[PDB]
Design a protein around this ligand. Structure first.
Ligand SMILES: [Zn+2]
Length: 185
């Protein structure tokens, strides 16, 4: 999988303590980036600091023609909801969204779950959510999923997110998912 290309998009809500989504996603994205570089995988970021709106991120991603595009987010849901969901475009607007992107979503869900990140109990089904409303996924022409790693309003998710150890956990799970999909390609 060395020499493959992966585009990482740190999204942009907040935790009750006021730890912002954009910083969580930025930091976790950096850890994922380091892990991938360690695997010989070529990476890029949607932004260079802690930005672009959804179109330039689509054009950047498409322009780089990556093997995989992974967007990182955290939800602001009702407090009792916790866990991750992996969003993918459905119904597909092209053949990549119809196949490779779905496989990527399934492999990512499996690996996040195997790494100790609980699947969302309040949204999607079994940690997956096929949807038609997200511009970022719809416009993608290369394999692309959007991961909501958890709910910032949930005490447990927020506890993981506001902790460096938790963020590294999330990164380890993400890297297992990405590497897992890349190997099938
Ligand atoms: Zn977001």
């Amino acid at each position: 999988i060395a020499g493959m290309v992966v585009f990482i998009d740190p999204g942009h809500t907040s935790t009750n303590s006021g730890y912002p989504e954009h910083t969580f996603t930025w930091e976790t994205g950096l850890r994922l980036r380091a892990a991938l570089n360690a695997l010989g995988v070529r990476t890029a970021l949607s932004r260079g600091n802690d930005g672009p709106c959804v179109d330039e991120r689509a054009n950047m991603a498409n322009a780089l023609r990556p093997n995989a595009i992974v967007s990182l987010h955290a939800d602001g849901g009702p407090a009792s909801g916790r866990g991750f969901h992996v969003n993918y475009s459905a119904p597909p607007l092209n053949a990549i969204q119809a196949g490779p992107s779905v496989q990527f979503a399934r492999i990512m869900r499996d690996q996040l779950q195997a790494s100790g990140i609980p699947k969302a109990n309040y949204i999607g089904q079994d940690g997956l959510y096929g949807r038609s409303d997200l511009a970022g996924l719809n416009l993608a022409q290369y394999p692309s999923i959007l991961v909501e790693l958890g709910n910032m309003k949930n005490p447990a998710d927020s506890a993981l997110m506001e902790s460096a150890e938790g963020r590294q956990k999330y990164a380890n799970a993400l890297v297992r998912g990405v590497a897992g999909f890349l190997a099938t390609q």
